[PDB]
Coordinates of C-alpha atoms and ligand atoms in Angstrom, one line a residue:
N1 CA 28.4 5.8 -13.8
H2 CA 24.6 6.5 -13.7
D3 CA 24.1 2.7 -14.1
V4 CA 26.5 1.7 -11.3
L5 CA 25.0 4.3 -9.0
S6 CA 21.4 3.2 -9.8
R7 CA 22.3 -0.4 -9.0
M8 CA 23.9 0.8 -5.7
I9 CA 20.9 2.9 -4.9
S10 CA 18.5 0.0 -5.5
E11 CA 20.6 -2.4 -3.5
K12 CA 20.6 0.0 -0.5
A13 CA 16.9 0.6 -0.8
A14 CA 16.2 -3.1 -1.3
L15 CA 18.3 -4.1 1.8
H16 CA 16.6 -1.5 4.0
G17 CA 13.2 -2.9 3.1
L18 CA 14.5 -6.3 4.1
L19 CA 16.0 -5.2 7.4
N20 CA 12.7 -3.5 8.2
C21 CA 11.0 -6.9 7.9
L22 CA 13.7 -8.5 10.0
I23 CA 13.5 -6.0 12.8
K24 CA 9.7 -5.5 12.8
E25 CA 8.8 -9.2 12.4
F26 CA 11.7 -11.1 14.1
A27 CA 14.2 -9.1 16.0
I28 CA 11.9 -7.0 18.2
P29 CA 9.1 -9.4 19.1
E30 CA 11.3 -12.5 19.6
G31 CA 13.9 -10.4 21.5
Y32 CA 17.0 -10.6 19.3
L33 CA 17.5 -6.8 19.1
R34 CA 20.0 -4.9 21.3
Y35 CA 21.4 -1.3 21.0
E36 CA 24.9 -2.4 21.9
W37 CA 28.4 -2.4 20.4
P38 CA 29.9 -5.8 19.6
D39 CA 32.7 -7.0 21.8
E40 CA 35.0 -7.4 18.8
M41 CA 34.7 -5.0 15.9
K42 CA 37.4 -6.6 13.7
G43 CA 36.1 -6.4 10.1
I44 CA 34.1 -3.1 10.5
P45 CA 36.0 -0.1 9.2
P46 CA 36.0 3.1 11.4
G47 CA 34.0 5.0 8.8
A48 CA 31.1 2.6 9.2
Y49 CA 30.3 3.8 12.7
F50 CA 32.3 6.9 13.4
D51 CA 31.9 10.1 11.3
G52 CA 34.9 12.0 12.6
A53 CA 33.0 13.6 15.5
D54 CA 30.8 11.1 17.3
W55 CA 29.2 7.7 16.6
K56 CA 27.1 7.7 13.5
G57 CA 23.9 7.3 15.5
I58 CA 23.3 4.2 17.7
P59 CA 24.7 0.7 17.3
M60 CA 22.0 -1.9 16.4
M61 CA 22.9 -5.5 17.0
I62 CA 20.7 -8.5 16.0
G63 CA 21.6 -11.9 17.4
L64 CA 19.9 -14.5 15.3
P65 CA 19.5 -18.1 16.7
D66 CA 21.7 -19.6 14.1
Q67 CA 24.6 -17.5 15.5
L68 CA 24.4 -15.0 12.6
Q69 CA 24.8 -11.5 14.0
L70 CA 23.9 -8.3 12.2
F71 CA 25.4 -4.9 12.8
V72 CA 24.1 -1.6 11.5
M73 CA 24.2 2.0 12.8
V74 CA 20.7 3.5 13.2
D75 CA 19.5 7.0 14.0
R76 CA 17.1 6.2 16.8
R77 CA 15.7 3.6 19.2
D78 CA 12.3 2.7 17.8
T79 CA 9.7 0.3 19.1
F80 CA 8.1 -0.1 15.7
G81 CA 11.4 -0.8 14.1
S82 CA 11.2 2.5 12.2
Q83 CA 14.7 4.1 11.9
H84 CA 17.2 5.4 9.3
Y85 CA 20.1 3.0 8.7
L86 CA 23.3 5.1 8.7
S87 CA 25.9 2.5 7.7
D88 CA 26.2 -0.6 5.5
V89 CA 25.0 -3.8 7.1
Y90 CA 27.7 -6.1 8.7
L91 CA 27.4 -9.8 9.2
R92 CA 29.4 -12.2 11.4
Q93 CA 29.1 -15.9 12.4
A94 CA 31.5 -18.4 14.2
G95 CA 34.0 -14.4 14.0
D96 CA 35.0 -11.3 11.9
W97 CA 32.6 -8.8 10.5
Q98 CA 32.0 -8.7 6.7
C99 CA 30.1 -6.5 4.3
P100 CA 28.9 -9.0 1.7
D101 CA 27.6 -8.0 -1.8
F102 CA 23.8 -7.6 -2.1
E103 CA 23.0 -11.2 -3.3
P104 CA 25.2 -13.0 -0.7
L105 CA 23.8 -10.8 2.1
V106 CA 20.1 -11.4 1.3
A107 CA 20.7 -15.1 1.0
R108 CA 22.3 -15.3 4.4
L109 CA 19.7 -13.0 6.0
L110 CA 16.9 -15.0 4.5
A111 CA 18.5 -18.3 5.7
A112 CA 18.5 -16.8 9.1
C113 CA 14.8 -16.2 9.0
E114 CA 14.2 -19.6 7.4
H115 CA 16.1 -21.0 10.4
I116 CA 13.9 -19.1 12.9
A117 CA 10.6 -19.9 11.0
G118 CA 11.8 -23.5 10.4
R119 CA 10.7 -23.5 6.7
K120 CA 12.5 -22.6 3.4
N121 CA 11.1 -20.6 0.5
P122 CA 13.4 -20.7 -2.6
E123 CA 10.8 -18.8 -4.6
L124 CA 11.0 -15.9 -2.2
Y125 CA 14.7 -15.5 -2.7
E126 CA 14.3 -15.1 -6.5
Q127 CA 11.5 -12.6 -5.8
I128 CA 13.8 -10.5 -3.6
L129 CA 16.4 -10.5 -6.4
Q130 CA 13.8 -9.8 -9.2
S131 CA 12.4 -7.0 -7.1
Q132 CA 15.8 -5.4 -6.5
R133 CA 16.7 -5.7 -10.2
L134 CA 13.5 -3.9 -11.2
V135 CA 14.2 -1.1 -8.7
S136 CA 17.6 -0.9 -10.4
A137 CA 16.0 -0.4 -13.8
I138 CA 13.5 2.1 -12.3
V139 CA 16.2 4.4 -10.8
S140 CA 18.2 4.2 -14.0
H141 CA 15.1 5.3 -15.9
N142 CA 13.9 8.0 -13.4
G143 CA 17.1 9.0 -11.6
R144 CA 17.8 12.2 -13.5
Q145 CA 14.5 13.9 -12.7
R146 CA 14.4 16.5 -9.9
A147 CA 13.9 14.2 -6.9
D148 CA 10.6 15.6 -5.4
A149 CA 9.0 15.3 -8.8
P150 CA 6.7 12.5 -7.6
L151 CA 5.1 15.0 -5.2
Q152 CA 4.1 17.6 -7.8
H153 CA 1.3 15.8 -9.5
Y154 CA -1.2 13.1 -8.5
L155 CA -0.4 10.8 -11.4
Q156 CA 3.3 11.4 -10.6
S157 CA 2.7 10.4 -7.0
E158 CA 1.3 6.9 -8.1
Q159 CA 4.1 6.5 -10.7
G160 CA 6.8 7.7 -8.3
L161 CA 6.7 5.0 -5.6
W162 CA 10.0 3.7 -6.8
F163 CA 10.8 1.4 -3.9
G164 CA 7.2 0.3 -3.0
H165 CA 6.0 -1.0 0.4
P166 CA 8.9 0.1 2.6
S167 CA 8.8 -3.0 4.8
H168 CA 8.6 -5.8 2.2
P169 CA 11.0 -8.5 1.3
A170 CA 10.2 -7.9 -2.4
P171 CA 7.8 -5.0 -3.0
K172 CA 8.4 -4.9 -6.8
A173 CA 8.1 -8.6 -7.5
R174 CA 5.4 -9.0 -10.2
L175 CA 5.2 -12.2 -12.2
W176 CA 4.0 -11.5 -15.7
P177 CA 3.4 -14.2 -18.3
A178 CA 6.5 -14.7 -20.6
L179 CA 5.4 -9.7 -21.6
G180 CA 8.1 -7.6 -19.9
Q181 CA 7.8 -5.1 -17.0
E182 CA 8.0 -1.6 -18.5
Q183 CA 4.7 -1.6 -20.4
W184 CA 2.6 -2.1 -17.3
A185 CA 4.9 -0.5 -14.7
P186 CA 3.7 2.8 -13.2
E187 CA 7.3 3.6 -12.5
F188 CA 8.0 3.7 -16.2
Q189 CA 5.1 6.1 -16.8
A190 CA 3.1 3.4 -18.5
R191 CA 0.1 4.1 -20.7
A192 CA -2.0 1.7 -22.7
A193 CA -5.4 1.7 -24.3
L194 CA -7.5 -0.8 -22.3
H195 CA -8.4 -4.0 -24.2
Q196 CA -12.1 -4.1 -25.1
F197 CA -14.6 -6.7 -26.1
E198 CA -18.1 -6.5 -27.5
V199 CA -20.5 -8.6 -25.4
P200 CA -24.2 -9.2 -25.5
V201 CA -26.2 -7.3 -22.8
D202 CA -28.0 -10.4 -21.6
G203 CA -24.9 -11.5 -19.7
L204 CA -24.0 -8.3 -17.9
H205 CA -24.0 -7.9 -14.1
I206 CA -24.0 -4.2 -13.3
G207 CA -24.0 -2.6 -9.9
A208 CA -24.7 1.2 -9.8
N209 CA -25.1 3.9 -7.1
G210 CA -26.3 7.2 -8.3
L211 CA -25.6 6.1 -11.8
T212 CA -27.6 4.3 -14.5
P213 CA -26.2 1.0 -15.8
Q214 CA -25.4 2.8 -19.1
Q215 CA -23.6 5.5 -17.2
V216 CA -21.6 2.8 -15.5
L217 CA -20.8 1.1 -18.8
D218 CA -19.8 4.5 -20.3
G219 CA -17.4 5.2 -17.5
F220 CA -15.4 2.1 -18.4
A221 CA -15.7 2.3 -22.2
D222 CA -17.3 4.6 -24.8
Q223 CA -20.1 2.5 -26.1
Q224 CA -20.4 3.7 -29.7
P225 CA -18.8 0.7 -31.3
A226 CA -21.3 -1.7 -29.6
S227 CA -24.0 -3.1 -32.0
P228 CA -27.6 -3.2 -30.7
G229 CA -28.1 -5.7 -27.8
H230 CA -24.4 -5.6 -27.1
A231 CA -22.1 -3.4 -25.0
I232 CA -18.4 -2.7 -24.7
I233 CA -16.4 -3.9 -21.7
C234 CA -12.7 -3.1 -20.9
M235 CA -9.9 -5.0 -19.3
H236 CA -6.2 -4.8 -18.5
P237 CA -4.4 -5.7 -21.7
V238 CA -2.4 -8.4 -19.9
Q239 CA -5.7 -9.8 -18.5
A240 CA -7.4 -9.9 -22.0
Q241 CA -4.4 -12.0 -23.2
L242 CA -4.8 -14.4 -20.3
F243 CA -8.6 -14.3 -20.8
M244 CA -8.4 -15.2 -24.5
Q245 CA -6.0 -18.1 -23.7
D246 CA -9.0 -20.0 -22.3
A247 CA -10.7 -22.1 -24.9
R248 CA -14.2 -21.1 -23.6
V249 CA -13.4 -17.5 -24.6
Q250 CA -12.0 -18.8 -27.9
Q251 CA -15.3 -20.7 -28.3
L252 CA -17.4 -17.5 -27.9
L253 CA -15.0 -15.7 -30.2
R254 CA -15.2 -18.3 -32.9
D255 CA -19.0 -18.5 -32.5
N256 CA -19.2 -14.7 -32.7
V257 CA -21.0 -14.3 -29.3
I258 CA -18.4 -11.9 -28.2
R259 CA -15.8 -9.8 -30.2
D260 CA -12.1 -9.1 -29.5
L261 CA -11.9 -5.4 -30.1
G262 CA -8.2 -4.6 -29.7
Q263 CA -6.4 -2.2 -27.5
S264 CA -9.1 0.2 -28.5
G265 CA -10.2 1.3 -25.1
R266 CA -9.5 4.6 -23.2
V267 CA -5.8 5.4 -22.9
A268 CA -5.0 5.1 -19.2
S269 CA -2.0 5.1 -16.8
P270 CA -1.7 2.3 -14.3
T271 CA -1.4 3.4 -10.6
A272 CA 0.7 1.9 -7.8
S273 CA -1.8 -1.0 -7.4
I274 CA -1.0 -2.0 -11.1
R275 CA -4.5 -3.1 -11.9
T276 CA -6.1 0.3 -11.3
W277 CA -5.9 2.8 -14.1
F278 CA -6.0 6.6 -14.1
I279 CA -7.4 8.6 -17.0
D280 CA -6.7 12.4 -16.7
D281 CA -9.8 14.5 -16.9
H282 CA -12.2 11.5 -16.7
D283 CA -14.6 11.1 -13.8
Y284 CA -13.3 7.6 -12.8
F285 CA -10.4 5.4 -12.1
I286 CA -10.9 2.0 -13.7
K287 CA -10.1 -1.0 -11.4
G288 CA -10.0 -4.4 -13.2
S289 CA -9.1 -8.0 -12.5
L290 CA -5.5 -9.0 -13.1
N291 CA -4.8 -12.8 -12.8
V292 CA -1.1 -12.0 -12.1
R293 CA 0.8 -12.3 -8.9
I294 CA 1.6 -8.8 -7.8
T295 CA 3.6 -8.7 -4.5
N296 CA 2.4 -12.3 -3.8
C297 CA -1.3 -11.6 -4.4
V298 CA -3.1 -12.4 -7.6
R299 CA -5.5 -9.4 -8.1
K300 CA -8.7 -11.1 -9.0
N301 CA -12.0 -9.3 -8.4
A302 CA -14.0 -12.2 -6.9
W303 CA -17.8 -12.1 -7.7
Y304 CA -18.8 -11.5 -4.1
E305 CA -16.4 -8.6 -3.9
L306 CA -17.9 -7.0 -7.0
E307 CA -21.2 -7.4 -5.0
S308 CA -19.8 -6.0 -1.7
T309 CA -18.2 -3.0 -3.5
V310 CA -21.7 -1.7 -4.4
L311 CA -23.1 -2.2 -0.8
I312 CA -20.1 -0.5 0.7
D313 CA -20.4 2.5 -1.6
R314 CA -24.1 2.7 -0.7
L315 CA -23.1 2.7 3.0
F316 CA -20.4 5.3 2.6
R317 CA -23.0 7.5 0.9
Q318 CA -25.6 7.1 3.7
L319 CA -23.1 7.7 6.4
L320 CA -21.6 10.8 4.7
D321 CA -25.1 12.1 3.8
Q322 CA -26.8 11.4 7.2
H323 CA -24.1 10.8 9.8
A324 CA -21.4 13.4 9.1
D325 CA -21.3 14.6 12.7
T326 CA -19.8 11.2 13.7
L327 CA -17.4 10.5 10.8
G328 CA -14.6 12.7 12.1
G329 CA -14.1 14.6 8.9
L330 CA -14.2 11.6 6.6
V331 CA -13.3 12.1 2.9
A332 CA -13.5 8.9 0.8
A333 CA -13.4 8.0 -2.8
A334 CA -16.7 6.6 -4.1
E335 CA -16.8 3.3 -6.0
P336 CA -20.2 3.9 -7.5
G337 CA -20.1 1.4 -10.3
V338 CA -19.3 -2.2 -11.1
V339 CA -19.6 -4.3 -14.3
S340 CA -19.0 -8.0 -15.0
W341 CA -20.0 -10.4 -17.8
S342 CA -20.7 -14.1 -18.2
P343 CA -22.7 -15.9 -20.9
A344 CA -26.4 -16.0 -19.9
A345 CA -26.5 -19.7 -20.6
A346 CA -23.4 -20.4 -18.4
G347 CA -23.5 -22.6 -15.3
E348 CA -22.5 -21.3 -11.9
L349 CA -18.8 -22.1 -12.0
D350 CA -18.3 -20.8 -15.5
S351 CA -20.4 -17.8 -14.5
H352 CA -18.1 -17.0 -11.6
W353 CA -14.9 -17.5 -13.6
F354 CA -16.2 -15.2 -16.4
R355 CA -17.3 -12.4 -14.0
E356 CA -14.0 -12.7 -12.1
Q357 CA -12.1 -12.2 -15.4
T358 CA -14.3 -9.4 -16.7
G359 CA -14.9 -7.6 -13.3
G360 CA -14.4 -3.9 -13.2
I361 CA -14.9 -1.3 -10.5
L362 CA -15.4 2.5 -11.1
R363 CA -13.6 4.6 -8.6
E364 CA -14.4 8.3 -8.4
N365 CA -11.5 10.2 -9.7
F366 CA -11.1 12.6 -6.8
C367 CA -8.8 14.9 -8.8
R368 CA -11.9 16.5 -10.3
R369 CA -12.9 17.7 -6.8
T370 CA -9.3 18.1 -5.5
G371 CA -7.1 19.2 -8.4
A372 CA -4.3 16.9 -9.6
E373 CA -1.6 19.4 -8.4
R374 CA -3.1 19.2 -4.9
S375 CA -3.4 15.4 -4.4
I376 CA -0.4 13.2 -3.6
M377 CA -0.7 9.5 -2.8
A378 CA 0.5 9.2 0.8
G379 CA 2.9 6.2 0.3
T380 CA 5.0 8.4 -2.1
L381 CA 4.4 11.3 0.2
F382 CA 6.6 9.7 2.7
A383 CA 8.9 7.7 0.5
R384 CA 12.5 8.2 -0.6
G385 CA 13.3 9.7 -4.0
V386 CA 15.9 8.8 -6.7
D387 CA 18.6 10.1 -4.4
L388 CA 17.3 8.1 -1.3
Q389 CA 16.2 11.2 0.6
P390 CA 12.7 11.7 1.8
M391 CA 10.8 13.7 -0.8
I392 CA 8.6 15.6 1.8
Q393 CA 11.5 17.8 2.9
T394 CA 12.3 19.7 -0.3
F395 CA 8.6 19.4 -1.2
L396 CA 7.6 21.4 1.8
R397 CA 10.6 23.7 1.6
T398 CA 9.3 24.8 -1.8
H399 CA 5.7 25.4 -0.6
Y400 CA 6.6 27.2 2.6
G401 CA 9.4 29.4 1.2
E402 CA 12.2 28.3 3.5
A403 CA 13.5 25.0 5.0
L404 CA 11.1 23.9 7.7
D405 CA 12.4 24.2 11.2
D406 CA 11.5 21.7 14.1
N407 CA 8.3 23.7 14.9
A408 CA 7.1 23.9 11.3
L409 CA 7.6 20.2 10.9
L410 CA 5.6 19.5 14.1
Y411 CA 2.9 21.8 13.0
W412 CA 2.7 20.0 9.7
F413 CA 2.6 16.6 11.3
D414 CA -0.2 17.6 13.6
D415 CA -2.3 18.9 10.7
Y416 CA -1.7 15.6 8.9
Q417 CA -2.3 13.0 11.6
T418 CA -5.6 14.5 12.9
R419 CA -7.1 14.2 9.5
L420 CA -6.1 10.6 9.3
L421 CA -6.8 9.5 12.8
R422 CA -10.3 11.1 13.3
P423 CA -12.1 9.6 10.1
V424 CA -10.8 6.0 10.7
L425 CA -11.4 6.0 14.5
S426 CA -14.8 7.6 14.1
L427 CA -15.8 5.1 11.5
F428 CA -14.5 2.2 13.6
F429 CA -15.9 3.0 17.0
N430 CA -18.9 5.0 15.9
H431 CA -20.1 2.7 13.0
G432 CA -18.2 -0.6 12.8
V433 CA -16.6 0.5 9.5
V434 CA -13.2 -1.0 9.4
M435 CA -11.1 0.9 6.9
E436 CA -7.7 -0.3 5.7
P437 CA -6.0 3.2 5.8
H438 CA -2.5 2.1 5.0
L439 CA -0.2 4.4 2.9
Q440 CA -1.4 3.3 -0.5
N441 CA -5.2 3.6 0.5
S442 CA -4.5 7.2 1.6
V443 CA -4.2 10.4 -0.5
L444 CA -3.1 13.8 0.9
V445 CA -5.1 16.7 -0.3
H446 CA -3.1 19.9 0.3
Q447 CA -3.1 23.6 -0.3
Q448 CA 0.4 25.0 -0.8
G449 CA 1.8 22.1 1.2
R450 CA -0.7 22.4 4.0
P451 CA -2.7 19.3 4.8
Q452 CA -6.4 19.8 3.9
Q453 CA -7.8 16.3 3.8
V454 CA -6.4 12.8 3.8
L455 CA -8.6 11.1 1.3
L456 CA -9.3 7.4 1.9
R457 CA -10.1 4.7 -0.6
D458 CA -10.5 1.1 -1.6
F459 CA -13.8 -0.6 -0.5
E460 CA -12.4 -4.0 -1.2
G461 CA -10.6 -4.0 2.1
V462 CA -13.4 -2.3 4.0
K463 CA -15.0 -4.6 6.6
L464 CA -18.0 -4.5 9.0
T465 CA -17.7 -5.7 12.6
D466 CA -20.1 -8.4 13.8
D467 CA -21.1 -6.4 16.9
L468 CA -22.0 -3.1 15.3
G469 CA -21.0 -2.5 11.6
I470 CA -22.8 -5.7 10.5
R471 CA -26.2 -4.2 11.0
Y472 CA -25.8 -1.9 8.0
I473 CA -26.1 -5.0 5.9
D474 CA -29.5 -6.2 4.8
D475 CA -30.3 -9.7 6.2
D476 CA -31.3 -10.5 2.6
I477 CA -27.8 -10.2 1.2
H478 CA -26.2 -13.4 -0.1
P479 CA -24.4 -15.2 2.7
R480 CA -21.1 -15.3 0.7
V481 CA -21.1 -11.5 0.4
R482 CA -22.0 -11.2 4.1
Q483 CA -19.1 -13.5 5.1
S484 CA -16.8 -11.5 2.8
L485 CA -17.7 -8.3 4.7
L486 CA -17.9 -9.5 8.3
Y487 CA -14.9 -9.0 10.6
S488 CA -14.7 -9.5 14.4
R489 CA -14.1 -6.4 16.5
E490 CA -10.7 -7.7 17.5
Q491 CA -10.0 -8.7 13.8
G492 CA -10.9 -5.1 12.7
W493 CA -9.0 -3.4 15.4
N494 CA -5.8 -5.5 14.8
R495 CA -5.9 -4.3 11.2
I496 CA -6.7 -0.7 12.2
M497 CA -3.8 -0.8 14.7
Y498 CA -1.3 -2.0 12.1
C499 CA -2.3 0.2 9.2
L500 CA -2.7 3.4 11.2
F501 CA 0.3 3.4 13.5
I502 CA 2.8 1.0 12.1
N503 CA 2.3 1.0 8.3
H504 CA 1.2 4.7 8.0
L505 CA 2.1 7.1 10.8
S506 CA 5.4 5.5 11.7
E507 CA 6.5 6.1 8.1
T508 CA 5.1 9.7 8.2
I509 CA 7.1 10.4 11.3
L510 CA 10.3 8.8 10.1
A511 CA 10.3 10.8 6.8
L512 CA 9.5 14.2 8.4
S513 CA 12.3 13.6 11.0
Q514 CA 15.1 12.4 8.9
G515 CA 18.2 14.3 10.2
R516 CA 16.2 15.2 13.3
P517 CA 15.5 11.9 15.2
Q518 CA 14.6 14.0 18.3
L519 CA 11.2 14.9 16.8
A520 CA 10.0 11.3 16.9
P521 CA 9.2 11.1 20.6
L522 CA 7.5 14.5 20.2
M523 CA 5.4 13.5 17.2
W524 CA 4.4 10.2 18.8
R525 CA 3.4 12.0 22.1
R526 CA 1.1 14.2 19.9
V527 CA -0.5 11.0 18.5
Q528 CA -1.1 9.7 22.1
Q529 CA -2.7 13.1 23.0
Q530 CA -4.7 13.0 19.8
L531 CA -6.1 9.6 20.6
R532 CA -7.3 11.0 23.9
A533 CA -9.0 13.8 22.1
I534 CA -10.8 11.4 19.8
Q535 CA -11.9 9.3 22.7
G536 CA -14.0 12.1 24.2
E537 CA -15.4 12.9 20.8
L538 CA -16.8 9.3 20.6
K539 CA -20.5 8.2 20.7
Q540 CA -19.7 4.6 21.4
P541 CA -17.3 3.1 24.1
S542 CA -13.8 2.3 23.0
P543 CA -11.8 0.0 25.4
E544 CA -9.3 -0.6 22.7
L545 CA -8.3 3.1 22.6
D546 CA -7.9 3.0 26.4
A547 CA -5.4 0.1 25.9
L548 CA -3.5 1.9 23.1
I549 CA -3.2 5.2 24.9
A550 CA -2.1 3.4 28.1
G551 CA 0.7 1.6 26.2
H552 CA -0.3 -2.1 25.3
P553 CA 1.7 -3.7 22.4
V554 CA 0.6 -2.8 18.8
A555 CA -0.5 -5.4 16.3
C556 CA 1.8 -5.6 13.2
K557 CA 1.1 -7.4 9.9
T558 CA 4.0 -9.5 8.6
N559 CA 5.4 -9.5 5.0
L560 CA 8.4 -11.8 5.4
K561 CA 7.3 -14.1 8.2
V562 CA 4.0 -14.9 6.5
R563 CA 5.8 -16.0 3.4
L564 CA 7.9 -18.5 5.4
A565 CA 5.3 -20.1 7.7
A566 CA 2.4 -15.9 11.7
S567 CA 0.4 -13.1 9.9
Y568 CA 0.6 -10.8 12.9
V569 CA 3.1 -9.9 15.6
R570 CA 3.2 -7.4 18.4
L571 CA 5.5 -4.3 18.8
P572 CA 5.7 -2.1 21.9
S573 CA 3.8 1.2 22.0
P574 CA 6.2 4.0 21.1
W575 CA 4.8 6.0 24.0
Ligands
ATP601 N1 2.9 1.3 2.5 C1 2.2 0.4 1.9 N2 1.2 -0.4 2.5 C2 0.5 -1.3 1.8 N3 0.7 -1.6 0.5 C3 1.6 -0.9 -0.2 C4 2.4 0.2 0.4 N4 3.2 0.7 -0.5 C5 2.9 0.1 -1.7 N5 1.9 -0.9 -1.5 C6 1.4 -1.7 -2.6 O1 0.1 -1.3 -3.1 C7 -0.7 -2.4 -3.4 C8 -1.9 -2.3 -2.4 O2 -2.7 -3.5 -2.5 P1 -4.3 -3.4 -2.5 O3 -4.8 -4.8 -2.6 O4 -4.7 -2.5 -1.3 O5 -4.6 -2.6 -3.8 P2 -5.8 -3.0 -4.8 O6 -7.0 -3.2 -3.9 O7 -5.3 -4.3 -5.5 O8 -5.9 -1.8 -5.8 P3 -6.5 -0.4 -5.3 O9 -5.7 0.0 -4.2 O10 -6.4 0.5 -6.6 O11 -8.0 -0.7 -5.0 C9 0.1 -3.6 -3.1 O12 0.7 -4.1 -4.3 C10 1.2 -3.2 -2.2 O13 2.4 -4.0 -2.2
MG602 MG1 -5.4 -0.3 -2.0

């Protein structure tokens, strides 16, 4: 009974994430979406669309080029394809509507997109299924806690993103070596001591900002067990296993150049990014390489990224220190330290492989400044709980003392969006700093539910525009690091468009306005207005803001289309 229900919860959640991709990436842009009732409804039960009083929202009909039609009730007409689905999904061909089981529905829906895109991916289908099955397990494990639990504690926020990226075909697909899911899954409240190795100090590459190289090394691993001339490095336990499978590491181990110390490192909890670890009451997160495909992206820390990390940290310090009047209230997590190791005697390709495997980044643990009970990762902040309801509602109800009315919700949204929009847009147009301020790179800092700061993080996806931001880089920096950092203005702005409005704010708005779709036009209008306010705040010209306020289509990153082919599409402005 808890198991059947957990399965059913995971199937609904999983399917919604898939629809999201279908609508955002195919239906809207290619023009297959209509808010219309089918001519024939045979096959659809009255209860699907009629609640006893009125239609259950608005009919959504998707006519796919292979003659597969989709029917769902939705709560609102949205240009970003953001809406609550208020009915099971119906499919029809030839006719006759059907409600297939999870597996047969996905397959048919995916074959529809395969037919549009003109290419098949059988690997993606298994990944959709494996993703859904892990979500099933996750709800079965977590689905008895109070449902806004994720929102009570930082670590719980990172562990409580049960369903993952809300517009992904397979957000929980993770392909471990044949090692199980639970031991490395945040959603199972995973802890491990980090693997550790003793390594001679001659092969270390250390980047440091405001710290000493020893201080950087200490932040990763306590260094007491290191013998003279050696040091202790850490590594994701799954990574160490993969690392030690390579006969070059076996050689150094046999020849005693390096030492496998065991899982003897600091005991740490993985965060939503899987390869980044949280240690409570420790100054830093630890972010290591993980040669494992997480949501179709191996999380290697390339050598030139380790390099860039350090430059970007340096920049974010100068800008904050000297340029605060033009950073629109920016709050960012520092990445002040970086370690990697390769044998001193190693040639260039071995050298790069070794540092890519041993690469680690220190990220400032903002909880020290902000209090763990006051920081919530934003992705969870606007996600659904074990009971498929937005967590933010009961979360706020508790902090305010009463269920938030329309006006309290609008107030709260205003306090939130300004703190997100100002920093990013000030960085972009004032400095060429392209953030990637999507949900998972963003952390609400709040005081009794009230937004104080929206902390931003992750310097790996921070870029510098060729026309303005680039000039913060020293012309003496290695060309490969420079290439790694450099974005075109249009390239930066497309990413900023997606992340800010589509990935982030659209989700914010949809969660705060569950049960109250009428708020969405009101919240979006406030975003438009807020963009206008930022424009007059700005020290550099911003023709791209003009275009967005005016109503040009918004760039939207793809998570299903890209898998089949393409990386970007365009969705109408919601205002
Ligand atoms: N709304 C969201 N937008 C983008 N990514 C999300 C979202 N929700 C969950 N995620 C997941 O979070 C991870 C973010 O990937 P990213 O590469 O930014 O992290 P990382 O750089 O590997 O680690 P860290 O963020 O700790 O630096 C991905 O696995 C992604 O699928
Ligand atoms: Mg990130």
